[PDB]
Amino acid sequence: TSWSDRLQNAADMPANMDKHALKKYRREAYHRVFVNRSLAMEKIKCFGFDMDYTLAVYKSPEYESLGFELTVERLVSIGYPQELLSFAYDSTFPTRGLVFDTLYGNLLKVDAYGNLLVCAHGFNFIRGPETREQYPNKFIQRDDTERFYILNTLFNLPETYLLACLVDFFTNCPRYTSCETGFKDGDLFMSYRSMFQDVRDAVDWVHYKGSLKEKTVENLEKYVVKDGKLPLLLSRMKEVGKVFLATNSDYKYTDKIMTYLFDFPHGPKPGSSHRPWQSYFDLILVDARKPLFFGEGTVLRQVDTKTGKLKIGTYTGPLQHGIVYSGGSSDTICDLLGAKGKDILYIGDHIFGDILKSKKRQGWRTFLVIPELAQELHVWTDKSSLFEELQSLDIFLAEISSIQRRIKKVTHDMDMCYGMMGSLFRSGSRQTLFASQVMRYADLYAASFINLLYYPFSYLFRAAHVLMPHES
Ligand SMILES: [Mg+2]
């Protein structure tokens, strides 16, 4: 059972809007909205959405496998060895948020400070003492964005696995010679960095020039999760405020995926006339180029909706019924909807491009969707027993040569229940970079934005007051 299976099984459920059915439902973790900083829902005036992996959650592992296979075929078609075609995506390896070090070819799981929690070279886990030969302080500067790349989105799951496949392949194929920074084949040297760049470019190419979009819209039932409760949530939001779409996808793909997600024999609820997806939004904006969107942005353009091409020129007019925007910036939303940052709850899945940058640069309220959270919650309960005993052992310390070894074996035991790269949020007792950025920049987070449906729209999401150590 994948994470997307749990969300499609939640998606098949119709809405029981009885207000205790909601209060009871919302208190099971899978359907709850979690709170890092307090949020008075009644002060929200604009609900904004990303599309891919927010409104449109792709089915796992079918979608990752498709992108992986298309990416590999792209690499082979530009000259990588034919043996890449024998690769097959394996969803139990990659965890989101890992760092690829283009210098030494390692995937790293790090904490908020760049401390190494996990180091894997290909498929072989480098344990502490050996990691020191390349990381003397067991630490990286995770800001050095020219050496390190953070595989931060669900679109990066295929290349996360692929990079480990490549490193393992070249390491063991006897026509290559391993060097510290890459692989030699006679007079040709392939560094890990150029290898990394080919994979990145292949993934881009598959997405923008290859057949990935086509194969997806050809079989949306196989690749995209559909939920009849989405029209209902958006229509409730449209009563209490304004709803808008700001997505990086182009209009044609947006229209194809949005149309699918509203393809029901009803509208907001069973019995009601179906409505076009566009009618659910006071403002629709494609080609957003987030996170640039939250700084200077780009020129505001108008989509020719009959053709899917942009109209020539910059759009200077007012917000108009039926108009579809391309580009612009966060201030475009604020101007045309007459909103300020904290009137805006932006709902998305990219911790950098949607959440961090809108919080830091514009002061927007944030809702982060974590699709894996459905599964992560299932694992964290089922095996929390060994975490409390892990946690009890860190103070079992207090004032004993085996104690520092039972902690290491418990931590590894906890990690493997999630996959080979461990939990999205933890390695044992230590929070990941990702976990830290969620807490710091996501005002709210949930396995799915649909969990909002189970809360009244006056609700005050409250988090505990934070206290410094000396304040206790
Ligand atoms: Mg997204």
Side-chain angles (χ1 to χ4, degrees), residues 1-398 404-472:
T1 189
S2 66
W3 45 268
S4 70
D5 284 342
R6 314 207 163 261
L7 316 169
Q8 178 66 96
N9 272 46
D12 299 338
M13 312 284 186
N16 184 355
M17 287 300 100
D18 189 69
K19 261 151 200 39
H20 190 329
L22 296 194
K23 148 89 168 151
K24 205 59 192 273
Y25 208 79
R26 99 179 72 146
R27 295 182 314 128
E28 332 176 21
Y30 307 68
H31 313 297
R32 200 175 113 179
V33 170
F34 305 103
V35 190
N36 288 316
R37 276 157 311 274
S38 278
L39 191 138
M41 261 290 122
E42 187 260 336
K43 296 201 293 189
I44 295 311
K45 168 181 187 277
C46 299
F47 305 92
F49 291 89
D50 166 65
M51 184 185 70
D52 293 311
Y53 281 116
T54 308
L55 295 166
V57 173
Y58 296 87
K59 292 197 184 177
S60 164
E62 288 90 342
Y63 189 70
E64 300 95 285
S65 189
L66 176 51
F68 179 87
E69 140 181 348
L70 293 175
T71 302
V72 167
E73 291 175 347
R74 174 56 180 181
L75 292 181
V76 176
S77 99
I78 81 171
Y80 274 72
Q82 313 278 311
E83 287 114 309
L84 273 64
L85 311 169
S86 93
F87 296 172
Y89 181 76
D90 168 13
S91 70
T92 79
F93 173 83
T95 301
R96 198 145 63 88
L98 301 175
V99 180
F100 184 80
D101 171 14
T102 64
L103 184 55
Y104 296 135
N106 303 318
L107 288 154
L108 306 171
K109 192 161 146 173
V110 298
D111 68 16
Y113 302 100
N115 298 309
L116 267 49
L117 304 186
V118 181
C119 180
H121 188 263
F123 293 138
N124 158 62
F125 277 39
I126 311 303
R127 297 307 175 181
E130 206 192 343
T131 88
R132 291 196 177 283
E133 317 171 40
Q134 305 187 326
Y135 309 93
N137 203 26
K138 266 162 91 149
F139 152 89
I140 64 176
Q141 299 157 297
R142 55 145 185 114
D143 87 317
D144 180 359
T145 71
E146 199 95 36
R147 179 174 164 187
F148 303 105
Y149 187 92
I150 301 186
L151 298 152
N152 233 8
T153 207
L154 278 169
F155 288 108
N156 302 123
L157 283 190
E159 71 199 273
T160 302
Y161 185 58
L162 184 44
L163 287 163
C165 286
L166 298 175
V167 171
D168 168 74
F169 172 75
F170 295 112
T171 296
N172 296 115
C173 184
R175 75 182 94 113
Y176 309 102
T177 292
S178 300
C179 304
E180 194 79 340
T181 59
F183 300 104
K184 191 208 183 68
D185 194 13
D187 284 321
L188 304 162
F189 181 76
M190 183 200 32
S191 78
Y192 289 118
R193 168 187 220 265
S194 67
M195 200 192 78
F196 171 75
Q197 274 152 187
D198 288 328
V199 175
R200 199 76 274 300
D201 292 336
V203 169
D204 283 342
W205 180 99
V206 155
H207 272 285
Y208 303 127
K209 318 270 202 56
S211 65
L212 173 46
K213 293 209 202 312
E214 192 184 269
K215 295 207 160 72
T216 300
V217 313
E218 246 162 42
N219 194 4
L220 295 157
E221 304 79 23
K222 186 195 185 184
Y223 290 116
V224 187
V225 168
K226 205 205 240 185
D227 180 343
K229 297 188 297 287
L230 183 138
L232 178 61
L233 188 37
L234 298 211
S235 75
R236 298 232 293 115
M237 298 175 153
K238 285 214 71 206
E239 325 173 349
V240 315
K242 315 215 209 177
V243 183
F244 71 87
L245 182 67
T247 170
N248 284 167
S249 48
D250 62 57
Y251 181 67
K252 280 189 280 219
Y253 185 69
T254 302
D255 190 12
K256 281 196 170 285
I257 299 297
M258 279 315 267
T259 295
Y260 171 74
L261 299 155
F262 287 80
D263 188 14
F264 295 100
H266 59 75
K269 55 196 213 302
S272 74
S273 294
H274 172 276
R275 315 206 259 123
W277 70 264
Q278 290 96 332
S279 62
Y280 288 89
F281 296 87
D282 296 292
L283 190 160
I284 291 159
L285 184 145
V286 296
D287 321 290
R289 260 151 297 202
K290 298 177 279 178
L292 173 55
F293 184 80
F294 290 115
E296 295 184 8
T298 63
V299 153
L300 180 70
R301 318 280 304 279
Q302 193 188 342
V303 181
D304 190 319
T305 194
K306 76 215 168 174
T307 69
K309 309 153 144 177
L310 297 172
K311 293 187 159 160
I312 301 297
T314 302
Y315 184 73
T316 72
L319 175 54
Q320 224 177 91
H321 165 80
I323 202 170
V324 170
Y325 301 103
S326 167
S329 74
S330 56
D331 296 332
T332 302
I333 308 302
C334 290
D335 294 354
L336 298 177
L337 298 188
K340 269 324 302 170
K342 284 182 267 235
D343 304 340
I344 293 160
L345 180 64
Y346 193 58
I347 299 152
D349 63 286
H350 195 141
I351 187 60
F352 191 68
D354 301 335
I355 309 289
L356 186 146
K357 282 291 187 189
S358 66
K359 170 63 72 180
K360 270 182 95 166
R361 296 198 41 78
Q362 296 305 330
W364 290 16
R365 317 307 312 258
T366 53
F367 187 120
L368 175 73
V369 172
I370 325 189
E372 307 102 309
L373 186 54
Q375 190 51 31
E376 283 255 346
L377 284 165
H378 189 81
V379 170
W380 203 74
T381 68
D382 267 338
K383 280 75 157 80
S384 81
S385 310
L386 82 89
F387 176 88
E388 204 203 14
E389 273 45 83
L390 172 58
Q391 165 151 222
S392 79
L393 170 67
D394 272 287
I395 50 100
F396 223 145
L397 191 150
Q404 331 96 21
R405 312 257 183 167
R406 165 67 141 53
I407 170 158
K408 276 179 186 170
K409 97 142 62 166
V410 173
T411 289
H412 181 257
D413 286 340
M414 184 191 306
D415 278 2
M416 293 302 109
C417 307
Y418 294 90
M420 292 275 276
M421 290 304 306
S423 169
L424 185 44
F425 310 102
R426 309 289 221 85
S427 184
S429 312
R430 314 210 29 202
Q431 304 213 109
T432 62
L433 173 63
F434 190 89
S436 148
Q437 299 189 318
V438 175
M439 283 172 91
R440 167 161 181 145
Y441 301 102
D443 294 341
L444 305 172
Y445 73 97
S448 158
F449 72 88
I450 196 84
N451 294 7
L452 287 166
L453 186 55
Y454 316 125
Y455 298 78
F457 275 156
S458 46
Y459 192 84
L460 172 64
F461 295 94
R462 190 186 70 85
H465 292 97
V466 181
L467 287 192
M468 299 186 68
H470 84 263
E471 289 168 344
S472 308

